[PDB]
Amino acid sequence: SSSIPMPAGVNPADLAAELAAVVTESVDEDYLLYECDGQWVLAAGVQAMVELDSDELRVIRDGVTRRQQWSGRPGAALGEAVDRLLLETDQAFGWVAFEFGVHRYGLQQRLAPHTPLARVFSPRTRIMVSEKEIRLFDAGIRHREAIDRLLATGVREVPQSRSVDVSDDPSGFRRRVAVAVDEIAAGRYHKVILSRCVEVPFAIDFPLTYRLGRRHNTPVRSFLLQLGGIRALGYSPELVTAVRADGVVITEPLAGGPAIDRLARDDLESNSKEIVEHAISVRSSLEEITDIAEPGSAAVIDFMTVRERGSVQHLGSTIRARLDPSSDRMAALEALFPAVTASGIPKAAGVEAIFRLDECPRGLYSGAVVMLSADGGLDAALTLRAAYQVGGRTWLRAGAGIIEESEPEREFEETCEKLSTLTPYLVAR
Ligand SMILES: N#Cc1cccc(-c2ccc(C(=O)O)o2)c1
């Protein structure tokens, strides 16, 4: 492990995104950049890839693909493969699809064959960028020379963004919300999150868009990736699960000018509908975390407080527990996935309603971006406020929590508001 001092007057997010863009392009390698607690970790190059699909598990290393049949819990299949990765490298990175969370509710038969559940890789090199320093892990000579060449120059100018039209409704979001409202009125479930894709008619420069959007937002976590033909970036508004080496498990569900921002904060703390849903959600997180925790260790340590994320303020709680010796970090992720914010209440009913009333598979949207460590660590950020590119198609995706009182026009405008997090910050390629 070697170190380079962080150059003064340079923002870590900008430098990490520039390294991700230029260093990985010169050697033509895949990567994942993950921001977590002031640290930007760039996982560059694929030493080994774990592909978990609905019908198969693959481990691809040095041109060789090992295929495996799997049965039971997807977390057990993923965990066993990722633990083997972590015996050779200190950290592993990737993404978990929304579809990974359907098995706990017995809904996996509704998945088409070859449905992606997770993609986790061990990188060839890691570059950690923070305000204090740049730390290099397993960086070969060719990579160290590329990093020094990038550092001898200033970061690129971020060009002006290109606007996107989000006013159209080709997937019939308004109609699908009306169906959900009728189902809720009939007592089938209490809440469901429905969403819509918005096609971007031009190719996006992902690392430059990442930089422009990160200037205005201070999210819980962020990511930028180019992995297995998928380009993605996002500003995670929620921590699904964090597992520490000492056994502490955390989950932080959310639920919700200077004078205008203070008035919005006062409403966020007094809104009855938001308070009721938050209490139900906190109770759901507590019941779920108790199935993997040491008896009597589950507790709410921060209850209903505002967290400022720069351009967005959230009402949230922190649920903590100690991981039971009979459980593991993948079981903890399975117990807390999918998030209530990504599914609905009751969670099983919300997930089932999403199969019928949303464009499926969701893939990365409402899934998680993850960082795992050899000492047992896990960090999983909820994937919302994200942009994607897969084989010629570039798109955004945003949803809304639909309840009995929801109105289709109001909820369409609510997805328009969530889309505003990225739409003015899209840099064209
Ligand atoms: N319940 C609930 C809830 C609270 C906050 C956000 C969301 C939600 C659903 C989908 C999205 C999004 O796409 O950003 O955000 C859902």
CATH of the domain at 70: 3.60.120.10
Please provide residue 14's backbone torsions phi and psi, each rounded to the nearest 5 degrees.
-70, -50
Give me ligand 1 centre to Cα 112, in Å: 26
> Would you say the CB of residue 418 lies under 6 angstroms from ligand 1?
yes
- Solved using: X-ray
- Containing structural domain, residue 141: 1-429
Q: Are 292 and 332 in contact (CB under 8 A)?
A: yes
List, in order, residues 6 or more apart from 298 with CB less than 8 Å away.
286, 289, 290, 319, 320, 321
Q: Which two tokens stand for residue 99?
A: 């579809």
Q: Could you tell me if the CB of 193 is within 6 A of ligand 1? A: yes
| Secondary-structure percent of the chain, ordered helix, strand, coil, rounded to 5 | 35, 35, 35
**Three-class DSSP category at 392:** coil
385 lines ligand 1 (CB under 6 A): yes
Non-local (6+) Cβ contacts of 141 within 8 A are none
- CA–CA separation, 108 and 283 (whole Å): 26
Amino acid at 209: T
Which mutation among 190, 315, 384, 419 tests ligand 1's pocket best, with the greatest number of atoms within 8 A of CB?
A: 384
Tell which residue, 247, 330, 243, 260, has the closest CA to residue 294.
Answer: 247
User: Whose C-alpha lies nearest to ligand 1, atom 2?
Assistant: 341
Question: What does the alpha-carbon distance between residue 171 and residue 349 come to, in Å, rounded to a whole number?
Answer: 22
* Ligand 1 centroid distance, CA of 341 (Å): 5
Give the number of domains in the chain.
1
Query: How is residue 346 annotated by DSSP?
Result: S
- List CB contacts of 37: < 8 A, sequence separation 6 or more: none
Q: Is the previous residue joined to 346 through a cis bond, with omega within 30 degrees of 0?
A: yes
Residue 198 CB–ligand 1 contact under 6 Å: no
Active site residue ranges: 238
Q: Which residues pair with 195 in a beta bridge?
A: 399
What's the Cα-to-Cα distance from 219 to each of 4, 270, 285, 421, rounded to whole Å? 26, 23, 21, 11
Q: Which long-range contacts (CB under 8 A, 24 or more apart) does 392-395 make?
A: 393/199, 394/199, 394/200, 394/202, 394/203, 394/204, 395/197, 395/198, 395/199, 395/200
Nearest to 38 by CA among 128, 126, 123: 128
* Alpha carbon distance 310, 288 (integer Å): 30
